[PDB]
Amino acid sequence: GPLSLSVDAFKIPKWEFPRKNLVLGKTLGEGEFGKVVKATAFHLKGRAGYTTVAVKMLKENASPSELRDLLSEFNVLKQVNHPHVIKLYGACSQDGPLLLIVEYAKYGSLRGFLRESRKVRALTMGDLISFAWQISQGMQYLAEMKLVHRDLAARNILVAEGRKMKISDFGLSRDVYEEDSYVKRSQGRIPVKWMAIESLFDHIYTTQSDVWSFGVLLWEIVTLGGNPYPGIPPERLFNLLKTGHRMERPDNCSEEMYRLMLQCWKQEPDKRPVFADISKDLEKMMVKRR
Amino acid sequence: GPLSLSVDAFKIPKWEFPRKNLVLGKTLGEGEFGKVVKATAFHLKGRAGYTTVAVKMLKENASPSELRDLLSEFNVLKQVNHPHVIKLYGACSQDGPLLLIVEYAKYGSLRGFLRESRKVRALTMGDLISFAWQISQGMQYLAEMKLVHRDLAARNILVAEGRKMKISDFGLSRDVYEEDSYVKRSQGRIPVKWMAIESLFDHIYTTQSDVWSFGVLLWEIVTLGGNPYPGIPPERLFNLLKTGHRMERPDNCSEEMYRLMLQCWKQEPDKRPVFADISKDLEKMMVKRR
Numbered sequence: 001g002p003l004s005l006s007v008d009a010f011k012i013p014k015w016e017f018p019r020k021n022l023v024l025g026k027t028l029g030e031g032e033f034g035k036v037v038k039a040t041a042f043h044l045k046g047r048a049g050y051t052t053v054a055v056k057m058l059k060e061n062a063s064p065s066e067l068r069d070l071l072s073e074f075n076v077l078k079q080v081n082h083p084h085v086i087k088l089y090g091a092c093s094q095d096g097p098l099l100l101i102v103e104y105a106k107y108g109s110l111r112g113f114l115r116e117s118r119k120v121r122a123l124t125m126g127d128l129i130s131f132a133w134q135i136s137q138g139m140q141y142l143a144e145m146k147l148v149h150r151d152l153a154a155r156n157i158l159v160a161e162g163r164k165m166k167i168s169d170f171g172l173s174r175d176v177y178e179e180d181s182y183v184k185r186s187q188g189r190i191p192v193k194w195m196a197i198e199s200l201f202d203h204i205y206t207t208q209s210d211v212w213s214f215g216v217l218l219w220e221i222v223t224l225g226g227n228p229y230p231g232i233p234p235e236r237l238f239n240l241l242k243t244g245h246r247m248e249r250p251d252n253c254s255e256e257m258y259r260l261m262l263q264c265w266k267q268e269p270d271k272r273p274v275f276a277d278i279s280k281d282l283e284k285m286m287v288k289r290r
Numbered sequence: 291g292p293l294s295l296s297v298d299a300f301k302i303p304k305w306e307f308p309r310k311n312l313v314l315g316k317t318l319g320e321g322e323f324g325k326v327v328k329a330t331a332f333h334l335k336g337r338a339g340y341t342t343v344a345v346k347m348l349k350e351n352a353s354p355s356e357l358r359d360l361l362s363e364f365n366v367l368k369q370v371n372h373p374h375v376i377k378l379y380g381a382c383s384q385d386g387p388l389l390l391i392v393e394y395a396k397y398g399s400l401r402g403f404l405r406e407s408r409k410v411r412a413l414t415m416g417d418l419i420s421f422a423w424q425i426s427q428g429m430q431y432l433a434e435m436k437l438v439h440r441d442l443a444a445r446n447i448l449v450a451e452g453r454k455m456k457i458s459d460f461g462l463s464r465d466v467y468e469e470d471s472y473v474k475r476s477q478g479r480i481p482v483k484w485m486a487i488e489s490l491f492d493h494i495y496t497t498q499s500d501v502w503s504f505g506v507l508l509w510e511i512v513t514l515g516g517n518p519y520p521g522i523p524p525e526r527l528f529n530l531l532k533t534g535h536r537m538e539r540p541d542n543c544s545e546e547m548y549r550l551m552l553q554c555w556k557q558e559p560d561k562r563p564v565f566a567d568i569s570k571d572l573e574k575m576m577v578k579r580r
């Protein structure tokens with residue numbers, strides 16, 4: 001089938017790293033098919049000595065779907081390069097289990113980073129605007145590469161040295177250089193509360209559904225890692241969404257910031273901002289703060 | 291899409307239980323889309339007082355796929371009744387999150403039960419044959435109902451009062467009254483090492499792939515909850531399987547028992563035993579022990 005082909009094609013040098021030069025450590029978390037461990041790599045792509053890295057692999061009892069996801073992620077990260085997208089350094093596929101060797105972000109996930117925080121780790125509204133803008137810049141680059149990410153959320157943004165945002169989890173990203181949409185027949189594996197109305201109902205993903213998700217991520221940013229649609233079960237979302245409802249303005253959120261969220265959630269995808277406008281809007285908010 | 295229809299159809303009495311008569315407790319485990327909590331139910335279907343039950347629900351950030359899985363499970367368990375299949379008592383779908391109220395098996399999962407054990411909790415080879423036979427009886431009943439289970443494994447068999455086996459996790463089960471196979475286009479979510487060669491390669495599921503899985507479960511039973519194909523990565527399974535290899539005879543395993551395993555793993559599905567023969571074979575082993 002499609003996977004046996006992918007596994008054989010794959011299994012037969014710029015990305016290949018010797019397993020014996022990688023040392024694995026503690027688990028950092030479980031993703032959308034994968035496990036991420038802290039690791040250290042010896043003589044990694046021209047860096048003399050050990051470099052602290054993160055390693056993505058399969059959990060116990062991995063399914064065909066998870067393995068395809070991991071191979072898919074690996075194939076997207078090869079093509080992708082941007083200071084606000086997680087960096088890929090290699091893979092180990094010859095001696096044992098498939099391991100992806102990626103950039104380590106010192107502060108962990110954005111959700112976790114925000115939930116350890118307060119308002120004024122003491123974070124300003126400028127810091128929160130800054131985070132959202134970096135992410136938006138990363139998204140505009142991916143949108144320019146013709147890639148829908150599909151799984152945009154605070155748990156999938158990492159915080160690197162100097163509080164730099166890194167977009168991660170590319171297991172679910174799709175190529176759209178051709179039809180400008182990715183249409184999935186079976187049911188998706190992206191959390192219900194982060195999905196655009198057309199993705200939920202019609203299984204259509206586009207850069208415009210990434211914008212929807214981004215608007216949900218914005219809400220997470222502004223609430224310091226709050227839980228979207230709190231106390232509302234996912235099954236209620238079909239009806240709540242189609243009848244026009246949206247999360248209300250959260251506390252500690254300017255009128256203009258809430259306007260940007262709502263705009264990302266417009267029912268008609270063509271009336272949502274593109275990432276270039278989002279970056280423009282957030283820039284404009286940053287400079288008027290003073 | 292297919293799910294919004296299912297969620298609306300569903301959301302609009304023999305199975306409906308009042309939420310206020312259910313009290314939730316500790317988590318028991320995370321399944322193949324779901325969370326299972328221990329619970330207690332007041333005046334549950336004619337039992338006066340509280341009955342200790344188990345409750346299946348969605349985890350945090352549930353996806354469309356998981357929700358469909360939960361609704362699917364609920365729809366299969368309504369039709370299903372057998373002393374060795376987990377019993378469904380109701381659902382709560384009107385006040386909050388979807389909850390399935392199911393039979394509580396006091397000893398937990400079969401894997402966990404076996405891994406706490408030794409050979410002679412001291413278990414004989416008769417006890418292990420007994421477990422496998424009860425499971426096989428459950429499978430023959432489901433096979434007669436025209437249901438492929440797809441996810442047969444020790445972690446999905448529960449151990450109830452009196453060490454009774456209960457087949458669980460019906461999230462992935464399919465109806466095959468019509469074409470006698472279930473064919474999935476996208477990649478499955480069943481662990482690679484429990485899947486028949488045709489399911490892995492050609493995405494075909496039949497009662498004959500359940501037999502394959504059962505043979506893997508047999509190995510788990512005989513090894514007291516060992517890990518299949520130990521130290522072999524899932525990606526190696528395409529090639530290992532198609533070139534004719536199988537797990538070797540484990541220790542503490544008769545010649546005849548190993549013969550039954552191999553037979554479940556025959557490449558050609560029509561040369562595998564049906565569950566009736568498996569039950570016949572295990573019965574025959576039980577009585578010759580003495």
Ligand SMILES: Cc1cc(C)c(/C=C2\C(=O)Nc3ccc(N)cc32)[nH]1
Nearest residue numbers: 028029036054103104105108109168
């Ligand atoms: C200190 C730390 C905590 C965490 C959750 C991380 C996570 C990651 C990390 O540091 N690099 C990563 C690359 C991909 C994914 N999916 C996760 C990570 N690092």
Ligand SMILES: Cc1cc(C)c(/C=C2\C(=O)Nc3ccc(N)cc32)[nH]1
Nearest residue numbers: 318319326344393394395398399458
């Ligand atoms: C004491 C105990 C431990 C465990 C893992 C259980 C698990 C279940 C249990 O007791 N009933 C269940 C029904 C369905 C599923 N998927 C799991 C269970 N019970």
